[PDB]
Amino acid sequence: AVPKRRMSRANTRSRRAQWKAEAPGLVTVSVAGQQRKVPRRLLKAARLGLVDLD
Amino acid sequence: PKPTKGPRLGGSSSHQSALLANLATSLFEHGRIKTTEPKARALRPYAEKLITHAKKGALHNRREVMKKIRDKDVVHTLFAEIGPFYADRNGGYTRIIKVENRKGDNAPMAVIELVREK
Amino acid sequence: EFPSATAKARYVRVSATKARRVIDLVRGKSVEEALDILRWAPQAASEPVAKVIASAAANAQNNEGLDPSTLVVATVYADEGPTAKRIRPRAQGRAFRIRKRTSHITVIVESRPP
Amino acid sequence: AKGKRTFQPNNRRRARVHGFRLRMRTRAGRAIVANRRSKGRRALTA
RNA sequence: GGAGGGGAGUGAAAGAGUACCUGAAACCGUGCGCUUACAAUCCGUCAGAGCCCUCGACGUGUCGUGGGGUGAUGGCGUGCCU
RNA sequence: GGGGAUAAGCUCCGUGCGUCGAGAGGGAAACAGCCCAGAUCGCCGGCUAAGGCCCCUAAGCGUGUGCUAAGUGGAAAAGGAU
RNA sequence: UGCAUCCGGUGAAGCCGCCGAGUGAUCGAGUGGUGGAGGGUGUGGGAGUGAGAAUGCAGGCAUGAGUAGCGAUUAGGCAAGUGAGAACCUUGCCCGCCGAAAGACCAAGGGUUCCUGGGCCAGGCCAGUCCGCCCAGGGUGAGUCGGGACCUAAGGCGAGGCCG
RNA sequence: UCAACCAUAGACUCGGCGAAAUUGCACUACGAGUAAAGAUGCUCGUUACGCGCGGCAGGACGAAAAGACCCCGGGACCUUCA
RNA sequence: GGCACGCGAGCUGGGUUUAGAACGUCGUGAGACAGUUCGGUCUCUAUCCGCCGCGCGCGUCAGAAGCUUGAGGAAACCUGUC
RNA sequence: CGCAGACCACGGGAUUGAUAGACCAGACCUGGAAGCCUAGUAAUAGGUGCAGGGAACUGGCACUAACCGGCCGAAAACUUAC
Numbered sequence: 001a002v003p004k005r006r007m008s009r010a011n012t013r014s015r016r017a018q019w020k021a022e023a024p025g026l027v028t029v030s031v032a033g034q035q036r037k038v039p040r041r042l043l044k045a046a047r048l049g050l051v052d053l054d
Numbered sequence: 055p056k057p058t059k060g061p062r063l064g065g066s067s068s069h070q071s072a073l074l075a076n077l078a079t080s081l082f083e084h085g086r087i088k089t090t091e092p093k094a095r096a097l098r099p100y101a102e103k104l105i106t107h108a109k110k111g112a113l114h115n116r117r118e119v120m121k122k123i124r125d126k127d128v129v130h131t132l133f134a135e136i137g138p139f140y141a142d143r144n145g146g147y148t149r150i151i152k153v154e155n156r157k158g159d160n161a162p163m164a165v166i167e168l169v170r171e172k
Numbered sequence: 173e174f175p176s177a178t179a180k181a182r183y184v185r186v187s188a189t190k191a192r193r194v195i196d197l198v199r200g201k202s203v204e205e206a207l208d209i210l211r212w213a214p215q216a217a218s219e220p221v222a223k224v225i226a227s228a229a230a231n232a233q234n235n236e237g238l239d240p241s242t243l244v245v246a247t248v249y250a251d252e253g254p255t256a257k258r259i260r261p262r263a264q265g266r267a268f269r270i271r272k273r274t275s276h277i278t279v280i281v282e283s284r285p286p
Numbered sequence: 287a288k289g290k291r292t293f294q295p296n297n298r299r300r301a302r303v304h305g306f307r308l309r310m311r312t313r314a315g316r317a318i319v320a321n322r323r324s325k326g327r328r329a330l331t332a
Numbered sequence: 333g334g335a336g337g338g339g340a341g342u343g344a345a346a347g348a349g350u351a352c353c354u355g356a357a358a359c360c361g362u363g364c365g366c367u368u369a370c371a372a373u374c375c376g377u378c379a380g381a382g383c384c385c386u387c388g389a390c391g392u393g394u395c396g397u398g399g400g401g402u403g404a405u406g407g408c409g410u411g412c413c414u
Numbered sequence: 415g416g417g418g419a420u421a422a423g424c425u426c427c428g429u430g431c432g433u434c435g436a437g438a439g440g441g442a443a444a445c446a447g448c449c450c451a452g453a454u455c456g457c458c459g460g461c462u463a464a465g466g467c468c469c470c471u472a473a474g475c476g477u478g479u480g481c482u483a484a485g486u487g488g489a490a491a492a493g494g495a496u
Numbered sequence: 497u498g499c500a501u502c503c504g505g506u507g508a509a510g511c512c513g514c515c516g517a518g519u520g521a522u523c524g525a526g527u528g529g530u531g532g533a534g535g536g537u538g539u540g541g542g543a544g545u546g547a548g549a550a551u552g553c554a555g556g557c558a559u560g561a562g563u564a565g566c567g568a569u570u571a572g573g574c575a576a577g578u579g580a581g582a583a584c585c586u587u588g589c590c591c592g593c594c595g596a597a598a599g600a601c602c603a604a605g606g607g608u609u610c611c612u613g614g615g616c617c618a619g620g621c622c623a624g625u626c627c628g629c630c631c632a633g634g635g636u637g638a639g640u641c642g643g644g645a646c647c648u649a650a651g652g653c654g655a656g657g658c659c660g
Numbered sequence: 661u662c663a664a665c666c667a668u669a670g671a672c673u674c675g676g677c678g679a680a681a682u683u684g685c686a687c688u689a690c691g692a693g694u695a696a697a698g699a700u701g702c703u704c705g706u707u708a709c710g711c712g713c714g715g716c717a718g719g720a721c722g723a724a725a726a727g728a729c730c731c732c733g734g735g736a737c738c739u740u741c742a
Numbered sequence: 743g744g745c746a747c748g749c750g751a752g753c754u755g756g757g758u759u760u761a762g763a764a765c766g767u768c769g770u771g772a773g774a775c776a777g778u779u780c781g782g783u784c785u786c787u788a789u790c791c792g793c794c795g796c797g798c799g800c801g802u803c804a805g806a807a808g809c810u811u812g813a814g815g816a817a818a819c820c821u822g823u824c
Numbered sequence: 825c826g827c828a829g830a831c832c833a834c835g836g837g838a839u840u841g842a843u844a845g846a847c848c849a850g851a852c853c854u855g856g857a858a859g860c861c862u863a864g865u866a867a868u869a870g871g872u873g874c875a876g877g878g879a880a881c882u883g884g885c886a887c888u889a890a891c892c893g894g895c896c897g898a899a900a901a902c903u904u905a906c
């Protein structure tokens with residue numbers, strides 16, 4: 001079935017703001033002598049060079 | 055090993071079995087491959103049970119390995135280099151390293167190797 | 173008020189509300205932290221945003237001569253730009269519209285003393 | 287299934303039943319051509 | 333990478349940059365002030381505590397033939413047209 | 415008054431009868447047609463109508479003499495009943 | 497719009513405000529900002545002269561909503577390369593599907609889609625370095641093939657003609 | 661009877677592109693009533709911290725099509741000793 | 743017995759009440775029969791209240807962890823033969 | 825990682841470790857492996873041999889992975905009585 005009424009402004013924004021993203025947690029790693037931030041998931045790979053750091 | 059609890063990997067039971075064999079062939083031929091993470095997780099209890107067969111090198115085991123990997127060239131590599139190399143280490147022949155996510159579909163990616171340390 | 177620099181990316185082929193989802197992660201952070209968060213964020217909308225913030229620092233660095241390490245992201249907001257309409261055919265003959273959206277992005281970085 | 291659409295294109299049949307030399311044949315047809323000329327049509331006949 | 337932009341220039345003007353006179357409303361953001369997570373609300377109205385801004389006179393802040401914005405709380409209150 | 419079953423928020427008539435229609439305000443909890451009363455506008459003045467005066471809720475747990483024991487008050491019949 | 501008057505690049509109209517005004521439609525030759533070329537008033541004349549609603553018309557934009565979908569019954573994987581960017585492009589090796597077809601050649605139909613070089617805001621239900629997409633250049637060779645220049649059927653047209 | 665388990669396509673989660681019917685509003689409880697006689701919106705009470713995600717379909721007299729049944733008016737077509 | 747003779751945005755379509763056909767009967771005829779007989783598309787992605795479940799935020803006058811009393815609810819309550 | 829699960833949550837482990845995978849061994853399921861030898865013309869049968877294959881249950885074993893890591897997170901006071 002179809003929406004019967006036009007959802008007001010307060011009701012639209014209340015639900016919309018739940019559609020967000022969570023910023024990743026970054027740890028500092030030292031590659032080739034410079035410190036770059038990589039997620040702790042990719043910590044081990046970045047030490048072996050498997051992770052490309054732009 | 056323990057069958058996949060969830061729904062299968064390639065989209066069917068038959069496709070998963072062909073998927074695992076091809077990956078194991080590529081892993082032994084090269085040494086390290088980079089695949090989607092749930093694929094690499096399902097490879098370990100499979101690709102390293104074959105090395106157990108090559109560890110006890112015998113004609114019977116060679117028939118067991120050849121009934122999965124289907125590639126005659128790799129079996130010689132498995133039984134002549136990979137086989138005796140791991141003759142002392144019990145279990146844990148492979149290691150899984152997690153890498154960047156794929157750009158297209160954001161699939162998680164993992165690199166599965168063979169332990170070369172000893 | 174602190175010295176500041178401005179950057180704009182007009183007519184970026186991304187939906188305006190899909191660029192605000194990523195901008196919200198980066199308000200008020202410093203540019204060095206901003207670029208590192210944006211690189212590892214798993215949203216394809218982050219590429220145009222990172223280019224603007226990198227450009228805003230580049231304007232501050234060279235056109236204005238502020239130190240790179242003292243820059244923080246003061247004001248960022250993604251407006252909406254021109255929309256081009258397409259048509260997608262459907263069942264039983266009906267033809268439903270499709271909106272191709274576009275957005276602008278503005279970034280201002282200031283040199284706030286530590 | 288039977289998905290045979292109404293329009294099955296053909297060129298001999300088109301110019302034989304909507305063609306110019308058919309249009310000029312009859313009195314009504316000459317009116318059709320003379321009419322479309324007045325409206326300014328680029329293609330007087332099929 | 334490009335698109336796009338920031339300096340520098342032309343220009344009386346770039347709040348005239350070939351998406352270009354003037355540039356409203358719906359719609360979409362960003363910053364700031366007030367208010368809101370024990371509460372039944374045709375969403376206003378009449379009282380109305382508190383906070384913030386402003387104009388005067390008098391000291392440190394305190395009143396006034398004052399002005400604004402928010403409004404806790406109480407009373408009343410059944411959309412517009414056919 | 416007729417029709418109806420002397421039923422209908424029924425239907426058809428009469429009434430220098432009313433109101434609503436075309437009418438706000440007070441009362442009847444809410445409630446066009448009942449009761450009080452016809453809104454020219456303002457006031458942070460006063461007296462009253464219908465209706466009320468224990469708290470919600472404005473003003474009396476008012477004064478005198480009685481009655482009720484059933485929450486009658488705050489639904490009802492033939493009839494029963496020291 | 498007649499007539500008479502006054503303002504305007506020392507900044508009109510229009511639009512956004514502040515401070516006010518009238519018993520109402522409304523007013524401001526009171527003033528800030530944007531603006532850049534026409535306006536006001538008195539008295540007459542004429543109106544395509546006032547929209548909130550017609551399941552009204554055209555344009556722009558919302559709510560549903562970052563939701564449903566992304567178009568079968570085959571299935572993809574790995575190494576290397578190009579590239580700023582690669583699940584989707586190229587090369588190689590495996591796996592799988594059709595095999596009276598999902599292979600090969602035509603007629604009708606389409607009309608440059610074919611090849612080479614180039615491009616990656618438009619399109620591809622995603623991204624794309626790729627493309628049946630966009631640009632430039634090139635390509636179609638007949639005494640014997642399918643047709644005309646040879647022939648007739650159904651049928652059409654029809655000198656004269658009859659009928660009207 | 662009386663259901664149980666397994667696999668695929670969806671559903672569900674992450675990344676990309678991204679619609680639709682409907683829509684006067686809106687920080688849209690329930691009970692007994694009242695009303696154009698079946699109330700989220702009125703009276704009197706009872707219950708209820710703000711915002712979401714996956715589900716079920718009892719209500720919003722849910723959406724779709726200016727009831728095809730019935731009646732009034734206008735057509736159309738058919739029948740016949742109109 | 744009530745809950746739209748509960749319940750079709752939950753399911754079926756056997757009946758009834760479209761277009762086909764036949765019998766009996768009425769009609770000169772088109773046709774008709776609260777007579778009979780055979781056949782005859784059951785659409786929709788859940789916005790709000792509701793309900794079954796699961797989370798995010800804040801509060802309980804510092805920040806946390808164990809173990810609990812329980813106002814208030816919900817479930818159950820059948821029964822025979824020897 | 826889980827016999828917890830749509831996501832989220834919940835429960836366990838995180839090198840001071842048996843949390844998952846592997847390896848060894850056990851239970852259990854299947855039923856007598858490949859190779860060789862013997863018998864038969866051959867289909868096939870017998871021995872080597874409770875053999876071989878094997879996932880989920882149990883126990884040992886750090887061999888691989890639980891990381892040279894980030895983010896949140898603690899107090900205006902006053903009055904009376906003792």
Ligand SMILES: CC[C@H]1OC(=O)[C@H](C)[C@@H](O[C@H]2C[C@@](C)(OC)[C@@H](O)[C@H](C)O2)[C@H](C)[C@@H](O[C@@H]2O[C@H](C)C[C@H](N(C)C)[C@H]2O)[C@](C)(O)C[C@@H](C)C(=O)[C@H](C)[C@@H](O)[C@]1(C)O
Pocket residue numbers: 724725783784785
């Ligand atoms: C497949 C797709 C179709 O679905 C159907 O077949 C359903 C199943 C019909 O029911 C059919 C089938 C059936 C059995 O009803 C279910 C029968 O009763 C009649 C013929 O309707 C519908 C909904 C009808 O409604 C019904 O119309 C009735 C007159 C009134 C009824 N109710 C409101 C009073 C209402 O539901 C009606 C008018 O056709 C709707 C109109 C708008 C359409 O034509 C629409 C566009 C159809 O194409 C359709 C909906 O897509």
